[PDB]
Design a protein around this ligand. Structure first.
Ligand code: HEM
Ligand code: HEM
Ligand SMILES: Cc1cc(N)nc(C[C@H]2CNC[C@H]2OCCNCCc2cccc(F)c2)c1
Ligand SMILES: Cc1cc(N)nc(C[C@H]2CNC[C@H]2OCCNCCc2cccc(F)c2)c1
Ligand SMILES: C[C@H](O)[C@H](O)[C@H]1CNc2nc(N)[nH]c(=O)c2N1
Ligand SMILES: C[C@H](O)[C@H](O)[C@H]1CNc2nc(N)[nH]c(=O)c2N1
Ligand SMILES: [Zn+2]
Lengths: 411, 407
């Protein structure tokens, strides 16, 4: 079956055959679409077929499908599975696997870069202190004094599900949130819970509006342990505006390195529950979501007062006006300090080129329109007008429950 | 069976049971989501009628009463004899209100039960259609105090005697391809404009020429008609801060009136059913004015604003977008023509959803369409999970008649 997608701005039609490979479920049915729903121990039995499918993919990618080396690898993995109930990936397979999980991430607009990904193999790691060291090196390499480089660090795979490696942080770098008795929140409201957990684990909170959180690291199923990332390793950018001199007095800053640390990486049926990865920001992530969401820093009102906008009625579009200014400020501040950032116009234009290329060379590109279209100025970006098909390919990045919900405390 | 939808900003969770009454297919499968694809007999007619009549009689709390069963036998008999049937006026009104209620891509549904239904099922000619349409336009415009309305022409018979309005909307602006190779006026209507000209329309060849109506009655060739200009309320576009805004030469019409869709009630097909409401400001200010394949005025406006157009990262397009949208709303408000901004419309829609979940067990909603084409995440709908499914009665798309009609 061939499926077509059309761009309604350019009339370009593309043909997807790749979706035929898709194994997993979407959440939708012939009678209901769950396209806007945010979230819609493996055995020997299920494991070899997952391993085979992955090695067939890997050996096709290197143009050695059906070779002796291909056949020998299948038998060796099969034998390792019957012997030990699991198997170990080669370095090369691990690299290919991690790159492909990114290549397959349908909610990621930054995928044009998928094949430049620095893979750090941390599968010899045994302790939380070892994790902290691996994570510091990742941050330093990825930050690169502002010239950001994509990277992922891969800790040991799940075994019985009782010995998981986890990074308890949702991102490697984030700011604390503190609920006051009067119901107001100081810092980032998204991190209130995680911040309480840290404090309870013995973190001494400085209790300001931008306190970088400590790392909370679990190795081999043990109780997690706290670490402060060295501050010379945390690149931050004070936010100012190219025309509004008062913008700086809002006291805003943000960190330069977006690094997601709470996803599960699946490769050939193996589960990597700690696999922190990082790229660089698209401006709207900070300026639209982090600063302007009502449940986040929520600065729209304050910024609009300072611009003296008419706030008596929504139809003055004061919210929209202040929103664009904050986003100019974010981009300007990053560019002036030579910290890599991409604006939403440029990122979306690159994505369309990436998608066309993927359709030609790969037979498709799974994409989640709800997520790809930026949270401001939707239809002035070319992705708004692009039909997309969403489907699940492996290797993949998946969500997993927050560890404080599942962890067995040892004391 | 029971499905939950969460709002991530407010933590409100709703439970959807209404989806279980869906019959039509979505285009998705368990292996693929098509949520962003724009277009994904006697025997057939009776279950359809029975399903419609059951929901009707239940809506007036007479499910399974004497009247209910009686109507079912009467429709059954008429189907058995004539191969079709006729809706009672009450059913036609209910079916139209519900097709709007069920329109998953419409953010304006809080208003669904206040719809004026004009029954035009006695119409026989294009001149008659023209009269009904003018009456619809004058009624709906109401000197700027807009009122929602639908006019419903005779249902389909053999499919060779279709009533059709060939316009996509009752009121739209002409578009002309030029020697230069550029486009004057609205490029979305270049083809339609040409069909009007090959029908003998004398085009003023301007940037805002109201198109004639092209009306097909009973399967015949369509005929041209000019709407009386005094019936077409228009708004000159000016800006509350920027004096120079007036000089761009911009205006828009007050009445949004979709005229190319098909209304399905009880298995009966109404191929001509123009309906109208009132604008959300972004439809004009973001889509009509700023789409690259439309009026595409971004470059011009950013110019008058002396913005830095060197690099995309100065957000010049975004700054200009906002001003333009302020201007559209300001103009309509100053002229007392009903309009709603995207903030107010999406807040009403969240309220409507809450109403529908408690009263009806759900609300079918297409997030890709409900979320405004600007400032998405600062509107509450962005943070609202929605379930999309197809309920009947419904509005459906149909082929452009010029690809189908036999001249
Ligand atoms: C190189 C620059 C990159 C840019 C500009 C970028 C852009 C983005 C953006 C804007 C999102 C949406 C996140 C949200 O709104 O919550 C996203 C999601 C995602 N990206 Fe990227 N990305 C980049 C690199 C990467 C890398 C290196 C990986 C992994 C190797 C990755 C994998 C993912 C995944 C798995 C998601 C889904 C997150 C979720 O569902 O919560 N991306 N990307
Ligand atoms: C009265 C105020 C109304 C507002 C503010 C409103 C708002 C909108 C908007 C913004 C769209 C999306 C159109 C697009 O982006 O192309 C839409 C679509 C739609 N609306 Fe409404 N609406 C209103 C009344 C109505 C009425 C009276 C009906 C019919 C009785 C209706 C039925 C529909 C349908 C069927 C669609 C989908 C059309 C398509 O797919 O092209 N709406 N509405
Ligand atoms: C690698 C990378 C590069 C980049 N530019 N941006 C990113 C996403 C990060 C940063 N800016 C947002 C954050 O995204 C990670 C969290 N994403 C939403 C998680 C979520 C919450 C609730 C329900 C769900 F289903 C999912 C990663
Ligand atoms: C009744 C009403 C009120 C309102 N405020 N707004 C409206 C939508 C009108 C106005 N502003 C746009 C137009 O919408 C009608 C055309 N809609 C898209 C047609 C289409 C093309 C190609 C593929 C598709 F799947 C669909 C109706
Ligand atoms: C309900 C809705 O699906 C949810 O708010 C989504 C919408 N699109 C998104 N898109 C991105 N990139 N990130 C998000 O967090 C969301 N949130
Ligand atoms: C490809 C994509 O589905 C298409 O551009 C859609 C997206 N969302 C939309 N939303 C509305 N309200 N109107 C539209 O025309 C569209 N276009
Ligand atoms: Zn779907």
């Amino acid at each position: 079956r061939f499926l077509k997608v059309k761009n309604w701005e350019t009339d370009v039609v593309l043909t997807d055959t790749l979706h035929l490979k898709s194994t997993l479920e979407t959440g939708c049915t012939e009678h209901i679409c769950m396209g806007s729903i945010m979230l819609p121990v493996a055995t020997k039995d299920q494991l070899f077929p997952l391993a085979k499918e992955f090695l067939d993919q890997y050996y096709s990618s290197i143009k050695r499908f059906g070779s002796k080396a291909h056949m020998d690898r299948l038998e060796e993995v099969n034998k390792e599975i019957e012997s030990t109930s699991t198997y170990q990936l080669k370095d090369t397979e691990l690299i290919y696997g991690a790159k492909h999980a990114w290549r397959n991430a349908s909610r990621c607009v930054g995928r044009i870069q998928w094949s430049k990904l620095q893979v750090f193999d941390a599968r010899d790691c045994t302790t939380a202190h070892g994790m902290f060291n691996y994570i510091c090196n990742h941050v330093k390499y990825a930050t690169n004094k502002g010239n950001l480089r994509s990277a992922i660090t891969i800790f040991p795979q799940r075994t019985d599900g009782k010995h998981d490696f986890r990074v308890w942080n949702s991102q490697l770098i984030r700011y604390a949130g503190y609920k006051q008795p009067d119901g107001s929140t100081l810092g980032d409201p998204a991190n209130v819970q995680f911040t309480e957990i840290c404090i309870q684990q013995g973190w001494k909170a400085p209790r300001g509006r931008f306190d970088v959180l400590p790392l909370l690291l679990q190795a081999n199923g043990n109780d997690p342990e706290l670490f402060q990332i060295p501050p010379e390793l945390v690149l931050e950018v004070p936010i100012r505006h190219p025309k509004f001199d008062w913008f700086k007095d809002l006291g805003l800053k943000w960190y330069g390195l977006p690094a997601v640390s709470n996803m599960l990486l699946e490769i050939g049926g193996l589960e990597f529950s700690a696999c922190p990865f990082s790229g660089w920001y698209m401006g709207t992530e900070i300026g639209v979501r982090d600063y302007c969401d009502n449940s986040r820093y929520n600065i729209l009102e304050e910024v609009a007062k300072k611009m003296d906008l008419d706030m008596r009625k929504t139809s003055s579009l004061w919210k929209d006006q202040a929103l664009v200014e904050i986003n100019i400020a974010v981009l300007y501040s990053f560019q002036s300090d030579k910290v890599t950032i991409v604006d939403h116009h440029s990122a979306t234009e690159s994505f369309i080129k990436h998608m066309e290329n993927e359709y030609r060379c790969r037979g498709g590109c799974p994409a989640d329109w709800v997520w790809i279209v930026p949270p401001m100025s939707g239809s002035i970006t070319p992705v708004f007008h692009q039909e997309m098909l969403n489907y699940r390919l492996t290797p993949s990045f998946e969500y997993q429950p927050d560890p404080w919900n599942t962890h067995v405390w040892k004391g």
